[model samples]
Target chain A: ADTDRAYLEINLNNLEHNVNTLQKAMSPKCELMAVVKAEAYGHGMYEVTTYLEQIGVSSFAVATIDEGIRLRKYGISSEILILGYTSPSRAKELCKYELTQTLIDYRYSLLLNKQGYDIKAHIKIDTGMHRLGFSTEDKDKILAAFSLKHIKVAGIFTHLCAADSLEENDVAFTNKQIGSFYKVLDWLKSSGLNIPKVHIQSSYGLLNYPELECDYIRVGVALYGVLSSTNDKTKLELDLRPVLSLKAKVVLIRKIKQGESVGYSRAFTATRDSLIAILPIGYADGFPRNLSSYVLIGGRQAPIVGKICMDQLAVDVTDIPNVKTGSIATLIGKDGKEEITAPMVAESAESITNELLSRMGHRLNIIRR
Target chain B: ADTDRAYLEINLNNLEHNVNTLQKAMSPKCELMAVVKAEAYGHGMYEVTTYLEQIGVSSFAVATIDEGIRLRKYGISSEILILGYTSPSRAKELCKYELTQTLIDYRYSLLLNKQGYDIKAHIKIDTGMHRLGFSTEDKDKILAAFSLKHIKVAGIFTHLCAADSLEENDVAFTNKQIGSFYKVLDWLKSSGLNIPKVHIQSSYGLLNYPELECDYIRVGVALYGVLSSTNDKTKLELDLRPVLSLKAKVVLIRKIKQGESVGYSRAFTATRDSLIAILPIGYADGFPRNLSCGNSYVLIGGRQAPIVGKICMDQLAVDVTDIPNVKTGSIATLIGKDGKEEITAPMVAESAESITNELLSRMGHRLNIIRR
Candidate 1:
């Protein structure tokens, strides 16, 4: 029996379309590296990545070394980048598994020297995003890494500081990042270092500014068919539909008299007699607690009645009189006239789409549609 | 090898002290009912409750029937109350398992009627909190419930809204809730219903006010040892240590140039070339991602680097340039400090993105806790 707890329904058709759109817009000039890091930004990795792989997206990027290893075990034959730097403790594994990882610091390069195997490496240049990358001084250090016989210098890339926004500070800053990366590439090429591939654009960069020349683009949220704004909508030109739909069955419903309360601390009081429904998704299942009083349900646009408890949230089903136990509701999906987009969840939940996605704990059954 | 993550060190001795203090403070009048709901407010459930039980806490409260079932499974012989409403779907389970639970709605009472067992239940009065509980009408609808073939009225309770602050609204509202509850209790008493226990105080209600009378006080964070205020700290007059400690190991330490950023979106830029140590604890493990940029950490008092970036799923890092190697297994204390000062959970809650209590997630390998 479905507990009628809230869930997400992913549309595979949209997954295919998003990839097709991106390829149509920028293919032949650039290659698409599916960014399935953090479980493809929390859209269910094994299934989403499988769909991407089926569509011929042969390259992948992840934030941590551990995430890469999971893919290898799952039979991912694609080139993998541990976009997140690996610790020296993991150097042996990185080489043994043949992962092309982001070589962000001297510590990693030193390990590559010690490992003495063809350690596929991507030189991360610190443009303006001072998060993970090599400095101008570090550039000389990396060129020194080229001398290591066993390590393979596969690529060079840099992250944009604020490419999401259409602001001027971000534009100039991003250009400097591109410029810094270009200078390193120019030096490496002149110095006779054969850098295999170069990538500089993440999802936002690919959607917003396509002119920046980079060989590979890491596409994440977009491929899952999530449009953050009219900006991303117009920018990515995603003929792609959404790949996720959340559904839950109502387990209980009660009619409360006027002035009665619901949920914890009596956060929602019935002004008039009200029918309340309980859905089994709460902060523990990725519906952020911050959306205690604000979240709405699918089709019904039912107002969530009270403080969202640890494992349950209540919705005012008074308006939807026909709703009953066993009837399904969508928390983050398309349903009739009611739908909660990931963008809307991000806004009302006062969280980023990334946090909203990754924070989903391991409890819900992930069934592919 | 220990990762540079913090450990949630729950001090058993402190739990004993807090319970002893509360028992001493409220003895001869109030009975202490430990609130072990929300997994004892995210402090390990079975372990924390067992310690409390061993220390002579006679009864306990949780928010759900499953929690009560879990306590019973652990051989907890004390009275366990599901303070939250017992859903109709699990009413039979509650009766069969011999647990006390709140009957918030009539549908559940109907379920209890068929079970033919003296199901111990509490009548939840919906005060002004507007959360869960029965209003006067609900009480009227289920007025004859106690007389049903096998239903025992164990207690009647209402939660105080904002009793922590005692503002004008809270005072008026709490009075209204109490008044409303009193009326229902009087009606039930006149109807010859037996409700031996009446509890209206939680950690907040028990601490802030002295006038509100009740037979039981639901003690939670206080029992584990955390004060809502320094003033409450003075009144409790007890030596309290947090019963849970979050611990993890430093998985990686990498030095970046002065200009490089550290994490996703480059949240933190290095001022000068610095060494950053990565710990294996992230938001997926309940470490709030809000500690991104340069805001969160688990330190060794005299230590220098702080945490950086958006906390990932299984790995988060602290800037440990000041601490060398900081390698594959350096322990970073998240909930307790090394010396002089302590980094309590509330300190992390200061980030405003998440709270310290919610920060502890059951992830990775943990140590068997010994009684302190």
Candidate 2:
């Protein structure tokens, strides 16, 4: 019954391969912190973190407190960092779960400290991505964070914006971000302020600026064995493998004559006699509604026809012969001689592979292999 | 901690209003089958269905067997119908839960019947939308379905393809579909087949053509209190109050000087000195990455500032104001309006050229619904 519809296959073997490949390029001091946020980029946080932990990865990062708690309850004993803001009202929960909360600003740090819960904190520096962080020039705020009695400063980090780009302006912007981060480190050295663990590199950060001196090189998509852009040139190229394969099997095959319409609103009309294979996965399952790609059936590409429904979509199987009910269709995976990669699918959906992967909702049954 | 991030507010009162409005338009013999598929179109299937059932909704429709099973387990004791395929191997489970399966074609009905379980089924007629169903001309297949021993024929139905469009060709095409559907009914009646019940109308179906003779009107989005488009002209306009309001609170307010970049890859940089309100919600919480709609704040008069920066997985920044003062816990409405300015579901969908159902269907499980 479970095989009747679509499911995601999590390749733990490929994940270990990716982990090994990333660790090889890093210095002995620089450990890899797996960003298991957003359910490990929709790869399942608890499961992915467990595998990563068993393989000797010492650190994990999630976006919310609940995510970290869930991982902790799942027996993830590694150092867990919250990559996003948690309201200070939940500081007790942070202490109870041994979770590290990101200090977005001076005021937030003060509020979290006043909670008197002996919480672990990471001071995020706003180098150029002014999204969240104390300013790089906020030496007073940085020193105050270090001085907070109840808040144990476990780490200090900054995000490098435009690090994924190779264009002239973007390269300079990334350098500016890097320079700003180094300046803060230098200020801390000069002021004799206590500097704990340091990190900056995310998946793209490590790709273009791999030589950055940091304790933790936070990686997500690479660890998942894919990048948002397959074409974006990077300084270092690793032999990455895809860890997740999204697939659905054909359940119904309908034959429509010329002038006959198919699917909701008749979005696709038969120019000639066409064979449509209905898949029980749709936009809700991350087969994007506006996607302009094809699903693979026995290595043959069956271009998707009609608008994708909430739970179903049809692809033109007229050209792909020998297709029948229960025949598996690869939406974002390898099939025989062909594979539909995430980046390719994402581009056609007018999104990045990151969004596409994250949108792989809870409805998609995951099978850890 | 639950209220720390973005949350969806489910307006059950408005939902009851929509159900009442639709029922008033229908004949006494006609009933309303609440389409609660895809977690009731991402409005929480169990909660919405529970409320609907309390308010006299006697039938429920879902897209998959898992959904029907979930509803049944959640104490939804109504006539639950599966709109999509459930493997023939699951016939026993279908009967055990009392969920009706859709008979797509002659072969599917045969496969489902031969499972030897007493399964209720609604025969779908492929009149114009050739997506599913036995063909309108397949009189032999119809009889074969009716003749199946264990498969109880609960109802028969067909989907109208272009009932949302008022264009001349679409109008004619819809008429063509309707005529073909009636043809199947006539053929069944003349052939001495027992027709138990019938349905066809979805949200747009009733909005455009409400007078169709059917036992049940299967309305989804309209029942959820919104349409895919706010501007699409329909034949009948009901007082459908929106049932879902998407909101987040101002977490951190950053005063960025001119020329400072905002989010990932610096998607937005300040022109003048700007005040940005960071919301603890992102694309993962049903907020589209390409959304252009702004969150509503009380102080600003009809003010809806553009969202700055590329939306991250757990956070997004709204260019709230140039002024310094902004409250941290004050609410920011993403899909609900403050006054003359509001963010409708259609507005949220149009920001990325997606439909309301598409946006609603994928609302992450992380967002807990606050039932009002």
Question: Which candidate gets the maximum lDDT versus the true structure?
Answer: 2
TM-scores of the models, in the given order? 0.78, 0.97
Best of the candidates, DockQ? 2
Write one digit per residue (lDDT tens) for candidate 2, span A39-96: 7888877778888999999899888889999999999998899988888888889999
Tell how far residue B200 is off in model 2, in angstroms: 1.3
Chain A TM-score, cand. 1:
0.93
RMSD of each: 5.3, 1.9
lDDT (10s digit) by residue, model 2, range B1-372: 556687888999999999999998887999999999877888888789999999999999998899899998899899998988889999999999999999988888888888999999898988777677888877888977898999999899999888989999888988988998888888888888768798989989889998887899999999988898768879898889999888787888878888876754445667788888888888777677776333222222346767776777778777767434456886777787665877788877877678898989888888878899
Write the residue-wise lDDT of candidate 1 on A240-345 in tens digits: 5677666666656767678777632445667899888777666655667778633344466788877765667788878775786667777777776656777777
Clashes of 1: 52
> Candidate 2: lDDT of B278?
82
Residue B101's C-alpha lDDT in candidate 1?
72
Ten-residue stretch with the least lDDT total in model 2 chain B: B292-301
**Candidate 2 to truth, TM:** 0.97
